[PDB]
Design a protein around this ligand. Structure first.
Ligand SMILES: [Fe+3]
Ligand SMILES: [Fe+3]
Lengths: 472, 474
C-alpha cells in the first residue's frame, strides 16, 4: 500500500476538483481513497510518499506514437515530407534494426517518456512483421512497467497509383533500399490474433493488443472490416491513420472518412490518427459515429503536413487525445512540450489567444486521451476505483515560478523535466527522477550503447547520419 | 374541466426518443397534453370532443422564433431589392410611422391568418413600433382574440449611432420624398414603459402572451440598457433578445465583433436570444456556445436583404438551440414555416456543396422542439409530450405534391408547399379547423383582405412611398 501525502491534487474528475494539501491512498494497483488533510487522517500505508509542495496529476497518456523509430532521430530524419521520410528513413531504418536494437529502442523511449510523465503509450507497431521484434519489445514493456496499447499495424493491398512519385523520392537516397511490408490478409489476421492471444492482458493487465489497419488505401475493405469486428468481439479498439497527407486525400474520389462511411467502417471503437486533410463534412462524419481521435500536432508540423482542425472537434465534444507520434518525427517524447505546441499552433493559425484553454489541453493529455483510447473507466483521472497511474510534478523551479493557475503554468511554462515521481498501476517506476528500470549508475553507459547501435543501424541501412551543414 | 381527444392520427412527437406513432391518439385537458397512446394497445379516455385525424399527421405547432409583424402591410412591391439599411430607412421606419392603430389591428390579424394557416402557433414578435401611442393596445387585443401564443419582445433604442450618418443621407436620397425617422428614447423612459407593459400584459390571455425586453442592437443601446434587459429577464424568468451582426456595418462596434463586445461586458448568458448572426466568425460562435446563448436564424430574410448566410450548421453541430424565424412580414415576404424550412435545408446544402449538411429531421426540429428551446420555453411547448401545452397541428398529405410520402420529415421539408395544414390547436383551443379560421370566418375573409389592401395603399400614400415601381428587368 502506498500513501501520497500533502500534495495538491489536480484530479481531472467530473467536477475538475483541485484539492489543496490532500492525499491519495493506493492499494493493489488502484486508487482506493482520497482526502483533505485538514478534515481526515489518511489510512495507514506501508509507505508514504511526501508530495509536500508538489502537484499530483493523473499520468499523461500518449494517444498515438511509434516507438522503435526513436533510434533514427538525431540527424537522419528531418527536413522531409511524409512520403520522403517514410521511404528513405522509416522503412529502411526499421528494417535494419535487429531484435536486440529494438529492445534498446524501447527502453530508451520508455526512459524519456516516464521522465516526462507519460504512463500510458499507444504504440503503433509498424515493424511487428519482423521475426523476434514482438518478443524483444514486449519483454522490455513488461519489465519497465508502462501501460501499453500495442497496436499491430498491417498492410494488405498495393496502392499502385503512387509509384512514379516513390521512385523519384527514392532517388534522393538511391543507396537506401526500397522495402515492402505487405502481407496477405489471412496471414495478417492469424499473426494479430496469435499476438493478441499471447500478450493481451499480460504484465498484470498493463499490456493490450489492438488491430491497426494502416490506412484506407493500404488495407482492403475486408481487412478493415475484420479489424472492426475484432475490436467489437474482444472489447478493444481498432485504429487507422487518416488523411495525414495530400496524396491520401483521394481514395477513389472521396475522402477517407467518406470512403469509410460508405462501407460502415466508422464506429465508436475506431480511433483515427492525424486528420490534417479534413474538411467540415469529414468532422461531421466522425462526430456522428463517435469516432475517437489522436492528434499529432508536433509531427504534423515536423513533416510539413499541416494543422488538423482540433478546435472544431473539441467544440463538438469529441474525444481528442494528444500523440507525440514517431520518435523520429517530433523528435522528442515530451508531453508537456507537445501540449505547449498544441496551445500555440492553434492560437496562431486562428489568431485567437483563447482558442483552447490550458485546462482543455491538459484534459487532452489526460482524461480525454483516456477516452480516445476507450480506457476512461480505468485511467486518466484521480478518482476512487481507477488505476493508480499518477505523477508528481515540482513547480519550484525558475521557469515555473510564479505559479497560481496550475494548468497555465504547466502548459505555458514547464519544460518537461519537472516530473519527479511516477506511479503506474500503483508501482513506483520513477522516484526523484531515478528510474527503476534504468538506474543512475547504468544510465550513461546505456545511452552510449543506444548511440552506438543507432550509428550501426544507419551504416547497415546506408543512411546518412550527419548531413553537411546547410543554411538554406 | 374542458377536454379534447385527437384520434387515429400519425403522431410526429418530437419527443425525447423522436417517436413517430401510427394510428395513435392524444388526450388534452385544460390546455395540456395529459396522455398519449396507440389505438391497438389502449383506449383513449372520454372527452368533451373528438377530433378525427384519420389519414392525417399530427405535429407540435410550429414556432416562429423571430419575426416582425406589423410590417406585413408594406409587402407587395415597396420592400424588395434593397440592402438592409436602405430597406430600413426608406421602407420600414417611414412605413411603420405612417401606420395608425387601426392599421396595426388589421396587420396583426392578417399576419395571424397567414401564420395559423401555415401551422405556426407561437410567434416571437419583435415590436419595433411599440413606441407609437395606441399600437400596443391595438395589437394585444388582436393577439388575445386570435388565440396565438405570443412573445411580445418590446424593442428599444437609447443611443445614437453617429458613425453611419453620411451613408444614411445617401441612402435617403434614393427616396428623398420619404421622411427620415427617429425612435430613440431615454433609457429611463424605455425601462418604465417596458416594465409597465410587462406588468399589464405578461401572462394575460390565459398565459398565452409574454413580454420580453429587446434592446435593438449593440450599437443602438447603451451598456446600461442592455444590462437592465439582462437583469430584467433573470428577475422575471423570461428572456431578453437582441439583433446581432445582421449587416457588414454592424460588424464593428468599437473594433471587435458584437459578440466580443457583449462578452467584455458580461452580456452573454443563457437567457439571451440573439437574432441573425450572419457576420459571424468561429470565435463568435464559440462565445455564444460557451454561454449557452439561444439563436434565431432568419434564413430567408438574410437572403432577401442581401445580407448573406449564417453559420447554422456550425451552431447546430455544437448542440446550440437554433430556431427558425420568418423575420419581417416585408423581408421574406411570406409567413410560411414550411417554405422557410425548405429554404433552410437548401441554402446550406448549396453553399457547403453537401447534400447531407442538415437532415430534414433536424430542420423540423428547428421549427419545433429546438425553436422552443431558443425561446426558453421547451418545458412547455415544442413536442407532443405529457405535461406540455396542447399546441398541435394536423397536416393532410393527400395532395399531389406530398404524394408519395414515406419519410414524413422529408416529405414535409422537401415537398409540402405550406397549405397542407388543416387544423390548428393552441393551448388546447381550436383556432383553425378544415382551414376555416375561428377569428377570420370564410364569409368575412375576402372583405377583410380588401380592407388590408386599401389600408396598405393608403399607408404608402401617407408615407410618400412608391408602391409599384415601373417594370425593370435589369
Ligand atoms: Fe503516425
Ligand atoms: Fe429581424
Amino acid at each position: 500500500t502506498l500513501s501520497i501525502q500533502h500534495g495538491t491534487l489536480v484530479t481531472m474528475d467530473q467536477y475538475r476538483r483541485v484539492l489543496g494539501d490532500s492525499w491519495v491512498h493506493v492499494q493493489d494497483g488502484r486508487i482506493v481513497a482520497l482526502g483533505v488533510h485538514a478534515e481526515s487522517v489518511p489510512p495507514p500505508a506501508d509507505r508514504v510518499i511526501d508530495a509536500r509542495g508538489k502537484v499530483v496529476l493523473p499520468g499523461f497518456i500518449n494517444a498515438h506514437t511509434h516507438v522503435n523509430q526513436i533510434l533514427l532521430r538525431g540527424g537522419p530524419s528531418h527536413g522531409r515530407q511524409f512520403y520522403d521520410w517514410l521511404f528513405n528513413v522509416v522503412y529502411p531504418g526499421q528494417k535494419a534494426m535487429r531484435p536486440e536494437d529494438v529492445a534498446v529502442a524501447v527502453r530508451l523511449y520508455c526512459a524519456e517518456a516516464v521522465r516526462s510523465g507519460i504512463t500510458t503509450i499507444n504504440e503503433n507497431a509498424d515493424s511487428a512483421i519482423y521475426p523476434g521484434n514482438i518478443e524483444a519489445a514486449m519483454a522490455v514493456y513488461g519489465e519497465v512497467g508502462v501501460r501499453v496499447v500495442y497496436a499491430r499495424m498491417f498492410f494488405d493491398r498495393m496502392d499502385g497509383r503512387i509509384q512514379g512519385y516513390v521512385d523519384a523520392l527514392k532517388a534522393r537516397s538511391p543507396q537506401v533500399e526500397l522495402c515492402s511490408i505487405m502481407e496477405e490478409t489471412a496471414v495478417a489476421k492469424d499473426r494479430i490474433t496469435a499476438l493478441s492471444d499471447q500478450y493481451h492482458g499480460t504484465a498484470g493487465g498493463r499490456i493490450s493488443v489492438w488491430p491497426a489497419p494502416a490506412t484506407t488505401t493500404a488495407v482492403t475493405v475486408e481487412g478493415m472490416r475484420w479489424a472492426q469486428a475484432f475490436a467489437r468481439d474482444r472489447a478493444v479498439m481498432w485504429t487507422l491513420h487518416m488523411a495525414e497527407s495530400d496524396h491520401d486525400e483521394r481514395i477513389h474520389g472521396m475522402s477517407p472518412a467518406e470512403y469509410m462511411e460508405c462501407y460502415g467502417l466508422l464506429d465508436e471503437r475506431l480511433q483515427v490518427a492525424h486528420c490534417v486533410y479534413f474538411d467540415r463534412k469529414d468532422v461531421r462524419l466522425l462526430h456522428r459515429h463517435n469516432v475517437k481521435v489522436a492528434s499529432q500536432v508536433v509531427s504534423n508540423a515536423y513533416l510539413g503536413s499541416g494543422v488538423a482542425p482540433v478546435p472544431e472537434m473539441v467544440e463538438r465534444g469529441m474525444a481528442v487525445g494528444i500523440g507525440t507520434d514517431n520518435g523520429n518525427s517530433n523528435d522528442s517524447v515530451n508531453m508537456i512540450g507537445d501540449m505547449k505546441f498544441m496551445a500555440h499552433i492553434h492560437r496562431a493559425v486562428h489568431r485567437d489567444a483563447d482558442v483552447l484553454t490550458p485546462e482543455k489541453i491538459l484534459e487532452m493529455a489526460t482524461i480525454d486521451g483516456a477516452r480516445s483510447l476507450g480506457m476512461d473507466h480505468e485511467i486518466g483521472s484521480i478518482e476512487t476505483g481507477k488505476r493508480a497511474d499518477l505523477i508528481l510534478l515540482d513547480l519550484r523551479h525558475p521557469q515555473t515560478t510564479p505559479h497560481h493557475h496550475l494548468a497555465a503554468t504547466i502548459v505555458f511554462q514547464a519544460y518537461g523535466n519537472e516530473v519527479d515521481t511516477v506511479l503506474i498501476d500503483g508501482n513506483v517506476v520513477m522516484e526523484n527522477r531515478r528510474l527503476s528500470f534504468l538506474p543512475p549508475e547504468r544510465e550513461l553507459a546505456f545511452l552510449e550503447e543506444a548511440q552506438s547501435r543507432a550509428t550501426a543501424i544507419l551504416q547497415r541501412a546506408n543512411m546518412v547520419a550527419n548531413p553537411a551543414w546547410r543554411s538554406l
